[PDB]
Design a protein around this nucleic acid. Sequence first.
DNA 1: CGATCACGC
DNA 2: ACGGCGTGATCG
Length: 579
Amino acid sequence: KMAFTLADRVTEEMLADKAALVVEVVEENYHDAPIVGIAVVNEHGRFFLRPETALADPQFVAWLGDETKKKSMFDSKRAAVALKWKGIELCGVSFDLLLAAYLLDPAQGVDDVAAAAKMKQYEAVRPDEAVYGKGAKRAVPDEPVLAEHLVRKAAAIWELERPFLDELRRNEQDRLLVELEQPLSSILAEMEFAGVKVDTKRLEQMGKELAEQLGTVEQRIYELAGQEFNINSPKQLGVILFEKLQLPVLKKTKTGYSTSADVLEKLAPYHEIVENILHYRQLGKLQSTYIEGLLKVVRPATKKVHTIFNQALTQTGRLSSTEPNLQNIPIRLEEGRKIRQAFVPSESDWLIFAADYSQIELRVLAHIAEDDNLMEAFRRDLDIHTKTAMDIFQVSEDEVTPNMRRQAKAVNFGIPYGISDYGLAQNLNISRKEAAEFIERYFESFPGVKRYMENIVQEAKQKGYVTTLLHRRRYLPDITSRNFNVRSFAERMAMNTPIQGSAADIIKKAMIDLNARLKEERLQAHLLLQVHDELILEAPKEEMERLCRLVPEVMEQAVTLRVPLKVDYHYGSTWYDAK
DNA sequence: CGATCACGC
DNA sequence: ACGGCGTGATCG
Ligand SMILES: Nc1ccn([C@H]2C[C@H](O)[C@@H](COP(=O)(O)OP(=O)(O)OP(=O)(O)O)O2)c(=O)n1
Ligand SMILES: Nc1ccn([C@H]2C[C@H](O)[C@@H](COP(=O)(O)OP(=O)(O)OP(=O)(O)O)O2)c(=O)n1
Ligand SMILES: OC[C@H]1O[C@@](CO)(O[C@H]2O[C@H](CO)[C@@H](O)[C@H](O)[C@H]2O)[C@@H](O)[C@@H]1O
Ligand SMILES: [Mg+2]
């Protein structure tokens, strides 16, 4: 049992200068979502407040907004954004249990207070699905049941703060929480709430044109197949290609015949249809995902989309982006790239500004592996893909063709993360003997990288985990497994996580540094998006010459490595034009 | 619901 | 079995 006051009014003792606070949003997507209840636990007791009451009370709202009144929460970004949608500011969050749990072990997939609690054998709180129900049974329960749940969550946060901080400190991860992840949560909240403005007319025009083209390509595909079928069914397509047209079966998966883009390209010498199928799939993706899917989530009266950056999901410390995902907007092909013309500034006479790290992962690799040859390339800003091409093809610089550089690109990206001769040969559609030579030559050229791959795997085996530059960890209990497949996957994770995760660390610290400076010089410029190794902003056009100086320097000096960090930048009237 | 396929880093 | 991390449309 747990005593608590189900309050009908806000009182002075509820406004202490340290509390656990719960501002409950039950909708998975919290943008413009109902707040269903509020709990406060502090030195003076435990309290449930109806939102209708607390959020209309001047003293409570002032307390929420006072940075000197410290709050411990779980997913303070959820609450801060839901409050923003109700026009209320939340300040003074000093501890976020979700971010603490994520840092202690991202593999646990902690997604509610109960799951965090279990890490410390705290059982005096129910799981959120046990109270609200799963999927179609999802509902806010009767007030006494809700109140007790919210109070129990607040009480768990209250008790768990110290145990979590003690373990983070033990791990030398406490500053990762308090100086990096928690300040970032604030910054992301602002990004999600501001949203990104979309030219829906343009998307609607594109959609109309795509539907025409889809129809044309579809009938042409039925013509060359001599049958009608569901092209979006890999199974039905496989029957057509490998049974009706008797094309060679190049790859069989655990389920059937592969019709992947790689396979279809390799089939091009056998039938023209595969080019049409590839074209259909590319148009089809644009339509369903980046036209239909985008327009479904745009808010019609403001024309904004409000993504959610999940800060506590990826195993390497990257962010993810959902509903809509704004981290996979097309760029590689010109047709898809045009989607970016529909991403526009939120005010007139504002511009989109985009800045990206040049090969952050390879630079981080150079730093961590301490390979002399790789480090010198970045110190001297030589094209690393051309350099590798020269080494693996054994030619001079002028003899490197664009196709050779593309092969070298896959070599540079793949080898340090454990690509084999088979994977390289399959990806590049080249001789497996030649792929194996590529690998031998790469390692004889960057021997520090070979030593890194050996050393980090051995460290993972000995410690049970790998670490990034700013002390993020990933545990790899699979790494000393007898079984080749299980062990091998773990070994490749040991090679990759310190590099991808350190890159994540660097850009997160860059975001925090940047917001400080923008707030410092009182510039209207603000962040809209992060795309793993790039930051996207909007600002009044007058602010562009400043941003060209400020943004790249802040990003490049976020950390100091054994090699320089390099940032490119562009701006224009749309995201497309910021090229 | 887990796989397949396409998009990004 | 045979580079890493994601989201999501779509299928059977
Ligand atoms: N108690 C600690 C110590 C370190 N770190 C992480 C976050 C730091 O940003 C990173 C850097 O490690 P250092 O021990 O080198 O600390 P700093 O470099 O931040 O301090 P300084 O460089 O001023 O010595 O390690 C942490 O999370 N918690
Ligand atoms: N198959 C891929 C493609 C890309 N990336 C990562 C590494 C790259 O640094 C980053 C950006 O991709 P680019 O193709 O732009 O890589 P570069 O900028 O190095 O190539 P280029 O010099 O041709 O722009 O995404 C990856 O890991 N695997
Ligand atoms: O609010 C983000 C935060 O909530 C969690 C659950 O604690 O995820 C929920 O919210 C996400 C954003 O809407 C959804 O994508 C997800 O499906 C839902 O469980 C955390 O995972 C996340 O960090
Ligand atoms: Mg590039």
